[PDB]
């Protein structure tokens, strides 16, 4: 969502909606509006290392960077790995990718799983919301699979409600009977229904077939349940059956994936190997936690004496388990690139500067590369954006949502491996409004969100 940050005398005072007719349309969600006060708490302001007693103590940039460079020079290849967080910009992502490639490492991962079978990351249409947010006004049938749009993407759910109210949309849900703000048709929560819909026996399948311009939306939250490949294959089969029975209607892009992490699409566009399984199958000796506060990898999944480097802006679960802490900048304190769930890249502007000794993320990575001896070819933000255009050119068009449909190839490659589903009901992580507020690192440090959780839990 497009916002206006109102600041006074170098302090972020509030967040307001900024009109964008195609994304948020004059509205923002409560988390977008009221979580800004978490930027004043639990901030990482200085570099920190481990002292003789194993405690974290402040140090200078030279000392921490030299220690990290010395650890990085010793290990090369598969022993070096990196994990990206949920609030990471494309510049830092590409800088870390290049730095780890300089030591012949490819163990770059994200905290969210996306199926790597078949086309995987190669085809951009495979992991995007191809219909786009503005396209929901043109559909008449939408099927949501294993997601809760109200909390995972509140503005997307508001768009769905607008289409439902004005265009008489028909909505069906496969998953837990969560309370969307509108009335939908609950087909059930078993994943097996998908196969039935892909078969043709189900009543809903006929509706999809006879309805021109249908939409099928699969939430990313249902791709982390150890069988997301099978669910994705079944949903792609449903989309293919739609595209075949009615033929190609033109440029409609039935298939859709709805993300909930702001750094995921940029990472995938940079080829960042989604999922943390690569770390588990080949444990590393130098771990680069780039804002990774999901708790996916703890010190029990790593070998003894594993050197862990955390680079972020908040003290959270991922911080105190590290050996060196490098203070980065929050999203309000840098001009950075984030890619939408539709693939629309946008850039932030600097509201205030990072507190204390915190620096820009890509600047930290570039300085580390210089100190380690494998200096990177960019010193200016414009040069880093040129590198981004080299790696993936769609990251420098800052309002373009256009793309090409490669659904045929992805569907063809998804048919190769057909690993079975499991008989577990699709349950979204966001079951109740109390789970909506505190979801990421900035929210958990916020006091307003604590008040909101306490109010929605024990109302009175």
């Amino acid at each position: 969502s497009n916002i206006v940050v109102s600041t006074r005398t170098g302090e972020v005072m509030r967040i307001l909606p900024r009109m964008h007719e195609d994304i948020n349309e004059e509205w923002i969600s409560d988390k977008t509006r009221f979580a800004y006060d978490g930027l004043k708490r639990q901030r990482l302001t200085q570099p920190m290392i481990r002292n003789e007693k194993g405690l974290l103590t402040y140090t200078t940039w030279e000392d921490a960077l030299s220690r990290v460079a010395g650890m990085l020079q010793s290990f090369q290849g598969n022993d070096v790995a990196a994990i990206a967080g949920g609030l990471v910009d494309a510049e830092a992502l590409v800088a870390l990718k290049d730095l780890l490639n300089r030591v012949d490492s490819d163990s770059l991962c994200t905290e969210e799983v996306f199926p790597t079978a078949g086309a995987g990351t190669d085809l951009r249409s495979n992991y995007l919301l191809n219909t786009t947010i503005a396209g929901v006004e043109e559909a008449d049938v939408i099927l949501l699979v294993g997601t809760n749009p109200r909390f995972e993407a509140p503005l997307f759910n508001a768009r769905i409600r607008k289409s439902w109210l004005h265009n008489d949309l028909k909505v069906a849900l496969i998953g837990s009977p969560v309370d969307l703000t509108y009335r939908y048709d609950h087909l059930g929560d078993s994943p097996k229904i998908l196969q039935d819909i892909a078969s043709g026996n189900h009543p809903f399948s006929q509706i999809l077939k006879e309805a021109k311009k249908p939409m099928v939306v699969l939430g990313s939250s249902a791709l982390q349940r150890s069988d997301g490949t099978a669910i994705l294959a079944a949903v792609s089969n449903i989309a293919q059956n739609i595209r075949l029975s009615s033929g190609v209607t033109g440029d409609w892009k039935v298939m859709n994936i709805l993300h909930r992490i702001a750094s995921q699409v940029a990472a995938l566009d940079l080829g960042y190997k989604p999922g943390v399984e690569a770390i588990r199958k080949n444990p590393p000796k130098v771990l680069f936690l780039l804002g990774a506060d999901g708790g996916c990898i703890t010190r029990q999944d790593l070998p003894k004496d594993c050197f862990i480097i955390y680079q972020g802006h908040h003290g959270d679960v991922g911080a105190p388990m590290a050996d060196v802490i490098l203070p980065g900048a929050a999203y309000t304190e840098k001009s950075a690139t984030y890619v939408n769930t539709e693939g629309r890249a946008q850039q932030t502007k600097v509201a205030v500067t990072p507190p204390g000794l915190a620096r820009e993320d890509w600047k930290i990575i570039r300085a580390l590369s210089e100190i380690a001896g494998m200096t990177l070819p960019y010193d200016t933000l414009d040069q880093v954006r040129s590198r981004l255009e080299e790696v993936s050119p769609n990251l420098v068009r800052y309002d373009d949502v256009e793309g090409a449909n490669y659904f045929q190839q992805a569907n063809e490659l998804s048919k190769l491996v057909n690993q079975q589903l499991l008989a577990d009901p699709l349950v979204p992580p966001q079951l109740t409004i109390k789970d909506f507020y505190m979801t990421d690192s900035i929210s958990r440090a916020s006091q307003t969100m604590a008040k909101c959780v306490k109010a929605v839990t024990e109302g009175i």
């Binding site: 940039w61 030279e62 500067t353 990072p354 620096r359 820009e360 600047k363 570039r366 300085a367 210089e370 100190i371 010193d379 200016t380 933000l381």
Partner: protein, 115 residues
């Protein structure tokens, strides 16, 4: 075309001629300035400072901009000849009380957020 009118010089050559005249005048004046203002610099220091100030904008290819630069140079020379400038104004060309800002990436990263 472009319907542009010159200040003094019609082409590049006349502008270069005026530039060389201004350079000769400044080169001549430097020793008298050093004596009158009781500066602690040598004549060679003043002359190479004049050369550096001339070369600071040696990339100009527009005769009008060159003419305006020569006019400003004449203004400064006339200010220095008539002792309208003081010792502080003359020494402001040397930045003697300013710490040298680093130009490499690592020092700038160490110092602050300014690129």
């Amino acid at each position: 075309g472009t319907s542009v009118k010159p200040i003094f010089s019609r082409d590049m050559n006349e502008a270069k001629r005026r530039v060389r005249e201004l350079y000769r005048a400044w080169y001549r004046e430097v020793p008298n300035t050093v004596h009158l203002f009781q500066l602690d610099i040598s004549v060679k220091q003043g002359r190479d400072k004049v050369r550096e100030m001339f070369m600071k904008n040696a990339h100009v290819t527009d005769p009008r901009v060159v003419d305006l630069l020569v006019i400003k140079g004449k203004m400064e020379l006339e200010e220095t000849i008539n002792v309208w400038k003081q010792r502080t104004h003359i020494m402001r060309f040397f930045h003697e009380t300013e710490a040298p800002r680093p130009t490499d990436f690592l020092s700038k990263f160490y110092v602050g957020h300014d690129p």
